Structures are given as C-alpha cells and as structure tokens.
C-alpha cells in the first residue's frame, strides 16, 4: 500500500528526447537512478518552470548518475509540440514520456480519476528500482528542483553507508 | 449489442471553440443534429485530411443544422495548441472536444486499448440523442466528409419521412 | 468493445451464387479481401439500391481481389426466389448467404433481437480475417458503394504501406 | 416435460393472410379451435403438398370452428411472396405466420437448432389454448390432412363427452 | 430441442414378450427399424384398441423389418397379467417393456409428470437411432396403425431412395411435364 | 435425518379397496393410528406372505383402532387385477394405494431410485401423524404381522402411559 | 433415500467387551454377519429389556456367527460402569462401542441432533458389509429379540439360495 | 479471536445436581459470577482431585456469590451415577451439566473435535456474561483450586474500577 | 488511488501533549492547517533530529496556523516515557499521537506492512481535510523542516489567491 | 478451535536480552521448553509485578531448561528503555520479544483487534512446540508465577511419564 522502499513495476511507453522519439522500459532504468517526474498536462498556461528548473540542473544530474524521465498522459506526440513551442521547455535534454493509455502513471498511483491527468508527484529510484523517495504537491504548488537533488544525494549516501 | 439505434450517455468534458476555452455536456447536444467525429491524436505525422475535410463542409453542415464534435483523448489545451500551430486545423470553426479520460469515448466503445487513443469513428446522432449512423475505420484509412454529409441528409429525410 | 481490427469468427452458411447453391465458411476468405454486407431481409417494399450498386462495382472488386458477402437472416432458397424476382438483385452475381440460425450475424454483433433481422452493416475485411472498416445505418440511410471502393483501395494501401508521414500539399 | 396436456405460451408474431399483413397474438386463438402448421422453408425444392393439402380441406375446417396457422422462420414478406409465386400456396386462405426470432417455434419446442427452421410439426389446441395432438416426421415423410382432420373430429367428441 | 431427427438415448429395460422375460436394451434396436409405442397403463377401463392395431398389422411389420416396443410405467411383472387377463393383449407377440423408473419415458420427453405415467405416443425409428416421425395425442384421441404403417413406408422410401422426394419443380416457370 | 418421531407430509393416491376406488390422502390418517406398509411389486413371483399375514390380523387393527395403507409404484388400476387374480391378495379388505408419481413413497425416503420400486418398509403413525416405528427389510426378508402388531399396542400403551420407569421391589 | 442395501461406512470406535477395552472398525465386520444395536444412554431410569433380550438369544447368535455391536454415545468407560453396576447389563458378552464422536452414528443416520443421543435403531449387516434389515423405534417401544433372530437366519437362506423366494 | 472480554453464548443443558435433575441455560447465569469447570470424561481411570478440590473450595465460593458449573460430553444420567459410584465426586453440591450434543462445550470452543470429549478448562464469568479469566491445560496437568479462588477474588476486585495504577 | 487533493479520513487516536494524555479525531484538525509527521519508532538509535527540527521550527508554525501531529505505532505510553528521557524529545510541544492499531498510519497509505511501523511520511493538510503536499523518504533518509515550511507557506499562499 | 495440543507456528521476531538486541524464531524453542508471556503494553500505570513475580522464578526455570519470552505489540526499542526506566523490569533477564506487525499475537490468537494489543495470556511449550498449558486472564486479574511453575513441573513430569494410573 505505502509505495515508498518498494519495487518499480515494468512499463513499456514512446518519448520525445533531444529532436527523436525512442521506446523507454524498466529495463533502461536499471543499474542507473532514475527521476520520474510526473505532472498534470503539455499546453497549461499555469507553471512550465517545474521542468525547466530540472532542466538548469541536467548537467548536475549526469554527473551525478541520475537519468529523468518527465511524465504525463499525453502522447509523446504533444510533447515534440510543446518541446518546439515554449523556450523554457525546448532546454529539456531528458526523456519527455508519453502515457495516454495511464499504465505507468497507474504503476504509481498517481491519477486523478476525475480528470485524467497525473499528478504532480516525483519518484526517486535506485539502480535496482527500489523507489528511495517520494514528493506529491496539488495543483498551482511548485516542486523545487534543489530540494530534489539533496534528496537524490541523500539517498546515494544512504545507499554507500548503511 | 451494436449501438445503432440506442441513446447516447451522459458526458462532461473541456472543449475548444473559436478563440475559446467552454465545457460541453449531452445537455448541448438535445434538440440537436450531432455528429460525434473520434480520432486518435493531435501533431501526428498523418495529414489532418479527415478533420480539414469537415471543415470545408461546415457551411454546408451549418445550413442542416449540425454541430460537429471533434473528440480525441488529447486535452483541450493541445486542442488549442494544434489549432495555432497547423494550417489545416486553423480552418476549425466546430468544438474539439478534449478526453483525456476517456469517457466519451468508451461510451461511444472506441477505444484502442493498448494505446489510449480513440479509433477513427463518427457518429452521426439525432435530437432525441438516437444513433442513426455509424462508421469506423482502421489507422490510414480515411473517411469521406461529403459522404458523411449524404449520410445526415438521409437520416434528416427518413426522420421527416417515416415509412416509404 | 469495437470490432475494429479484430479477427472475424468462424461460421458454416449455405449461400446461393449465380445459380448453385454452395456452402461458405471462414476458411474461403483466408487469403482474400472480403466484404460482408448485411441487409434486413428480402421481399421488403424498401428498395434494393444498396445491393444494385455493389453489383454495379463487382467487376471492380473482383480485379481488386475482393469477394463479396450479402447476408441476411433469410434462407438461400429465398435469395434465388428474390435474385428470379427482383430486376435489381437479378444483377448480382456475387454470394447471398442465408442466416436463418443468425449465428454470422452474431458474430458481428449485427442482431435485431427484436426483429430477428440484421443491421445495415458492411464489413471490410482483410486475407488475415482481420476487420478494417465498419459501417453502420439505421433504416432508409443507404450506403454508397464509390464510398465503399474507396475505403477498400485506402485499406489495400495501408496494409502494403507504413504509417502516412505528409508532405507540403496535405 | 411433454407439451401435450399443456397450455400454448404468449405470443405476437406478424402475419400474412389474403392480400394484407395482421398481428397474431395467442388472445386471438382463445375461444376457438386452432391448428399450429409448423414447416422449415418458403419457396424450397420440396413440394408443397402438406401446405395445399389442408387449404383443400380448410372450409370443412371452418365448420368445424379450427383455425390453421401455418408457421415459419421466414418474414411475413417472404411469406406473401411466395403467396403470389405458387399456385399451391395460393390456395391458402389462412394465416400464414412469420417466425424470424423463432420466439412462437421455440414454445412449441420446435426449432432445428442446427439450421434456424422449425421442424415439419403440427399441434392441434383447443379453446382453452390446451394441447390436445402432435404430429412431428422428417423430411420426405408427408403429414395427411385427412389423419388431421380425424384427430380433431375426435378432440372435439372427447371435449363434449367426458 | 426437437427430438425428431435426434439419435435414441441408452435405455435398460426388463420386457415381457411371447411367454417370457427378457432385457432390452439400445443396443437391440441397432440395425433394424423400431416403434417405441407409449401408453399410459395396464388394466385401465379405457379401450385396448390401440395396442390391438398395431397386434393385426405386426406380421406385415415383422415384413418390412420393424420391431415394436410396448412401453409403459408398469412393470414387466404387470404385463404379463395382463396379456393372460385380456384377449386383445393376449394377441401381442411383441415385446411389452416396462419402465418403472421413467428412464426410458423421460428419453423420449413422454411422462406426465402429474401422474407419473407416459402420454400416448408412437415413435418411428432408423437403423442408425435417429427418430424419423413422432406421434403424440391425449386421452381418447385414438392413433390407426395404418397411418403409423403408411410413414414407415415412407420413412423407408426416403432412407433407400434419397433425393426421390417431391419436387415443387412442376410449377414456376421451370417445369417437367 | 431419521424419520423417527417427525410427522408424516401431505399426500393425495388413488387407492383400491373392497371393489371400490377412493381417493386418500393426509386429512383422512387424521385422529387414527395408521399403518403404512409399503412393498415393491404386484403380480411378482415372490410369495406375497407379508400382505396375506397382514389381512389375517387385520380385525385385531380394526379394533385397535388401526388403518391400514398398503402402498406401492404400480398404479390402483393393477392393485384391482391383482385383487381378484390372487388368492392372498383377495382377502386384503384395507386400502392398497398406488404411487405412480412416487411422491408418498419418496416423502418416507424408501424409492429404490435405480428400479423406480418402493422398499419392502413398515411406518407405523399415531393420531397425531407422528411415526413411532420404522421396519425395513430387504428381498427375501419377510416382515412378521404379530411383531408389527405388539410395536402398536407398545406405541398405544406409551401414549397414554407416559412418564413410566422400571419398576423394583420384595418382601 | 434409503439405507436399506447400502454398504456400511468406515468407522473406529473405542469399545468395552467382557472385562477389557478393544478397538472396533469395519475391518473387524468384514466377512461376518453384524448387528449394530443403537441405543440413547447408559444409566437411563427405563428398563434394559432391549439390551438383556439379545444377550438372552447370545448362545444363538454364536451359532449364526453374528457379532453384536452395542453403540451409544456415551464412552466406552460409562458402558464399563453400567456393566458392573446393572444385572441385566452385567449379561452382555457382546461389544458395548461407546461413539461420544457420533461418527458412527451418523454413519446410519441415527441422530437425534438436538438431544446428542442415537435413536433405538437396529441394523442387521451382511459379510459384504451391505445393510440388509433396519429397524428404529421411538421411546417406549421395545424392539423383540426374537423378531431380530428371524430376520438374521431369513437374512442367511437368502444370501445362500438365491432366487428361491 | 481470544474468548477473553467476550460475552457468553446462549445454551440449554440438563444437570445433576445434589439429587436432583434441573434444566440450566444462559438466563440462570444472569446476576451472578460463574465457573464453567469443563473436563474430558466421567468413569476414567485419571484421578478426579481437580473436581473435589473445586468442591472442597464450594462454601467458600457460595459465599462469594458464585456458582460452580461442571461441564462434559456424557449425559446428567451419568454424572448422577459418578456421583454415587465414587466418594470424590459424591462430595460435590454443585451442578454437573451434561453436554452429549457439545453446543455448550462449543460455544466456550473447547472440544477435543476427534475425541468427542471437552478439554480442561475453566472460564470464570462476571454477572454481565462477560468472560474475565481462561485456563486450559493438557492430559495430568492438574488445575488448582485455591488458585481459581484468587482469581475469582481479584476480579471481583477489578469488576468494580477503572483502569488500574500503581501505588509505588 | 492518489492520496493528494483527497480529504483525510476519519480517525480516533490517544495522544500525549505538554504532560496530558489527550483524544484527538479528525474533527479537532477541521478548521485549521495540520500536519501529519509520521515517523517509524520512539527509543530508536536513529537520529531523532527530524521531531527536534520540528520543535525548533514550531514557533514559525504556531505564527501560520498549523497544527504539528507526531505519529508513530507506538503507544501513548511510550510517547509520555521518550519525552522524559531524551532532551530532543523533552522540546516536543505539540502532540504526539498513538496508533497502535495502525488505523490513522492506514488511512495515510504509510505502513511497512512487514514492520509494523509508519514510514518516514510528512502531510500538509488545509483546513478542509485536503491532502495539499505529501512528502515521503526511505530509512536514513532524513526530512529538512525548512523545505516544510517553505511547501507550507507555499500551500497557504495558492489557497489565499488561486488566480 | 482449541489452541491446546497445538503445534506452534513459525515467527521471526527482534528481541532485547541483557543490554542485547537479537533476533528469536521458533527454531531457537525447538528441543525446549517455552513459555509466552503475553502482555497489553510497555510504561503502562498498571503495576509491574507479573513480569517481576517471572524474573524471582527466572534462576529456577532456568535449572528447569525453560526459556521465557516476554511479548508485546511494542518495539524490541522500547523494551530496552522500559528494562532501564523501572527497577522491576530491570530484573528481567529473559528475552523481551517485540510484535508490533503483531504476528506473533495472532499466531497464539491473543489480540485485542480495537486496541492493537496483546491479551493477557501466558503460553507453556513443550520441545516438539506443542502447547501444554494456557492462561488469559483480563485487566487487573494477575497471574501469580507460582502456579505457573507448578504446571510447567507437572507438564515435565507427564513427558517423562508417559500415561498414568493415578
């Protein structure tokens, strides 16, 4: 029931990533920590700076081992389209995953049931899958990108020094 | 059972309209000709001919008092999007329904469920909300607008002329 | 659930073409285009333009490599009364299945429970059994059979073809 | 579980007879003698000779107060056709039912499940809608009208003289 | 659910037949025609006739190679009695089955489960099992042996000569004349 | 599960007795002691001692108080030719039942469901429809009428001598 | 549906015959003539007769080779007791089974299952196991020694003359 | 689910009690404290000190307003026979509740269910029905009386407060 | 199936605050802003920093509104004890409540079903019940109260004026 | 239904034991006698004295070849600060067997289901993990230590003697 400290359900969803669209599994994510950065919907007016703080922060991320995967119900196609529409998310060099069908937003339980759309929640996995920290928010509030990376050196240290 | 000549299902969802953004239930739809045309998704690769097709007939469309609804599982803020950014889409004047839950479309049992996308269907509806016309196809295959116009000029004579 | 893009049932049904009388199951549309074109009954006072028009296109279809399937919930010994009595049906030299147990017309979800008699639906399908375009009408809206060839050419194009990527005309 | 001795079920069938459609219900049958006329087919390769052969002895049917109600999977449409085709079914000035959803065929236990055609059967009912004769053969074995006719004259003595 | 044109089911039976018992089963109809004739009970005031019938026409059943089974929900002990007691019955030298349990009634959808006898039906059967005509009617509603002996005749026809049946080809357009 | 001291259901036979057809059922074993005797077959070739035994102390039940219900799966049309046919069976001045339906001999849980016969069994009921003995036997076993009669007059003599233990006492 | 020519069903009682305590199945029944005489209780205020009557006709049923089995559902300790503390009980050489389990009665459908006591049922039981007669009675009503002799020996003539009446 | 702090079951048994026979059910528990004292078997070779060390303690525990009930699978007949046949049991003057059906034994879920016999155990009961104490032992684990009547004393105690808090 | 934006469900826990044993329900948390920290055991060699840290930012929340639940699996009893024993704990001025049957650490999704015991959970609750942030980390993984505060004022700014 | 002449079930529990935390299963009662000693909850008003009344007769079960577990719904943490805050709990030297999944509990079915505590229940074990003797009792009534080693004396003496006259 609680989702924290356990394992990542395999999945099988297209993205958009650097001008291309690949095919992304849970056998890409292991033997590298992952980011699963899940938000309602492409094309909102409301607050684009989410993914694009994570984007200032890439570089650090690669150093650091750590792969993102941004999520949403739409189709890796609306993701292109945004990706070339808005400069602030046209800096997103990570994986842009399209999930129309709700499989790997569900594998999280984090769908709004009424609306369709996931929600604003952030998953940190290990390289063996094991989910080491979790981070939901409703809508209109922000996730901030350096509380993220304290967590994800957080949970490397933990994962070197038991 | 085939849903030809049943009543269609209560609905709630976000649309785009002209410039704007309003919500469309079966509410709108009662007194109203209806055609319901499914699709599966916005900024495809594939030439929005099928959707750019019903736009050249909408004059036509509007002079036999018929509301098109075109519905895909997409929001209706890419509707928006796809609206501004492509030629053939500009050319819309009719409400693009957005169904990210896929409501409507499983209520009208058309949804592709390993993808998560509608299949390519219209469905053209009477003003009792009664399915006078059904017509699926599969991806690449494309539906003829002027025969989809010969469809409702039929349905509104045989409503106007019972018996023959 | 749709139809669409699902692979037709096996079925065993007496038909009458173009003088014999033969019996038609799944195994004789392996390989083959097929159209199954279900219509209520026959000796009804509607008119029969819907089977006159495919007949008219028959030669078409035939070098397309598309055979042709009229159904209804009537016998194979009514078809040839009708194909005899009808100047219309007397054009058709495609089968007239009979489904009097309505088990074909099952198959496609196709039954006037009330009535005993099929929709108004015609069926493309493809060599693989697989059904790539339905169409539907209530009574008295027909069906146009230049729409019908249509689809078939589209259907044969994408089976040969990927995914359609659009150029500058659109 | 034998239909004779048992009451003949509901039904509502479309109908041909002379030149016009009717309904038939089994509120129409209650108060007189009736004679259910099942076969397999209109317009078949097979004689209709059973058909004829009780259109000839339908006025002394009339004395008797028997209505015949011949039965069938074919339309009411196909049944006025074949009226028109024949010269035997010409003859028939009774009612000629419609059994396309095999509702009034399956009440009487009936239905060739196997082929969508009610069996070569005739039931003789009296006016309390009791069955009182069965008369089922194959196909080639023919029905006589004359046997028909003894039976009922005999039903008749038996439902006067307790 | 018809049962013409519907193989016999497995049956076991004790029988009286020409001064003695003996057990019937399916396995006894086999290759040969049969008439399962069902009555409702032995020692009844009602008239033996229809049992007498069948009596007069078996050397010319017996002609045509078809067997006839009596049958009944009284025993084959009662059967016996009652072909010394009544001349008419005294006739039979055909097999008197007897069905206590209903098994063999019930085969043939023929008991009335009120009574727990077996209605007044005749059927025809093949070599091969399969019910060729059937014939049921209510009490005092009588069944001649020379309409049963008629179909027998044309079930025989038909089953020798396949495709000899009626054409409505002498009529409509085409004909033969 | 026993039938032992539950009351007896309701029932509707035709029945033979004394050249006369009647119809019994529950309502007429109402406020009488009554036997019923079931047993498998008429005109059978085994000897029908047991219903012979019984007619020959059928006075004695008469002035006890005590009817008598032979029951069996033949109908009463065979009881009545059996009735003149056999010597035995023409002293049977009680009422033979017939149980083509099988409803009473089931409703005593004694149809041999394989032979469509009822069991050779005797139920012994009180006024009050309750049954106070149970004897079944199988083919071959013959049941003694003298035993079935001292089951009855111990089943009167409990009724209306309830509340007795064994007695003791000398000198 | 009737017991009447059916086989009897496993059973493994604890027993008190004759000064000492055994173990009784079905496998000790196999190939005897057995009768289960069903009982209420042990130290009940009516008479014995029932159980003292065919311990009166024992020397008999040795000669038919018949075991007697006496069952209640009390222990077989309580049928110990009775059998030193009753005169007419202190005559049993037969097998008092105690089934305070009620599996073997129940094996006969011979509970009265609200009071937890068997009902006055006799069963006379063939080397092949089969039930050949049933006799029950209800409070009372004494069920004679004699009566279930004659039926044992007429048991006997007909497993050994088939046919002959 | 433990039977503590639980509400007791409705049952209806026959009992021997100082020569007489009475019908004992739930309604007579009503009102006062209780002991189901259960065991295997009556006439057993096993020595009966557990009840005569019950009855022994029974003047006692009358004063104490609470009532003895000796529960097992054989019938109110044979208790009253036990009774007469040895001096131990001969000494006890309160009811011996017979349970040949085992509802009673059942319902306090004591059945030794392949014996047909009850285990050994005891359940003392408060006037509300209500189960305050337990014990159940195995074959020649005898129970103790004295201890029984500490309990019984300390419940009493407890019956009448809320929840306890130590002194120190 | 997501937890966030749903109201919490109704509870009813005992729970030890400033020396008094106390019952606390939902009904006490409606009407005011409440946060949920869960956390696994009392009397553990882990750092207990992450109730401290709370406490040293308490007169910040006290100045918001906001309510401070501690849970854990352990009971009551066991709170009044570790708040007489460690001087971090002995700082705890608000409450801190028991949940041994594990219903109100249920009710939040937040039980290591093989443990017994409450994962490292923190939820900012409205005064409506509505679940507005949620905040969970593996063992070892330790919670900043400053990142708390900021969601929290966060929260309470998009609830004065949405837009 | 009874849980007497039952075989114990298999448990995997954390455990203090001397200023020690270990680990206990029901491989460690096998070949030994065990009692359970069940209890509701640690720092509780309630007076200490059962377990106390267990650590006087602790040297004597000992001799005996007779382990005692001490269980609760509270953490094996929590038995160590409880072992150092109560002078009566210090004397126990037996090992203090933590449940807060609770399995152990439901194993001998002794949970209060709306507390999410132990009932008061002590449980004697014999070698082959079958259950000789039980005893519940409710708040407040105590179970004195005494009469427990008096059964557990008895239940000894009945293994090693094996069916009795008297």
Known sequence: MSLINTKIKP????????????????????????????????????????????????????????????????????HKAWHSSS?????????????????????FDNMREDEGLADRATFVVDPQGIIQAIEVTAEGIGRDASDLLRKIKAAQYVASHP
């Open 87 to 107: 400069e602030t998310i046209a800096k997103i060099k990570y994986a842009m995953i399209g999930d129309p069908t709700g499989a790997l937003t569900r594998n």
């Open 11 to 78: 999945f099988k969803n297209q993205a958009f990533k650097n001008g291309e669209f690949i095919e992304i599994t849970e056998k890409d994510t292991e033997g590298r920590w992952s980011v699963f950065f899940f938000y309602p919907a492409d094309f909102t007016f409301v607050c684009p700076t989410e993914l694009g703080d994570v984007a200032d922060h890439y570089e650090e991320l690669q150093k650091l081992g750590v792969d993102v995967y941004a999520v949403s119900t739409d189709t890796h196609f609306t």
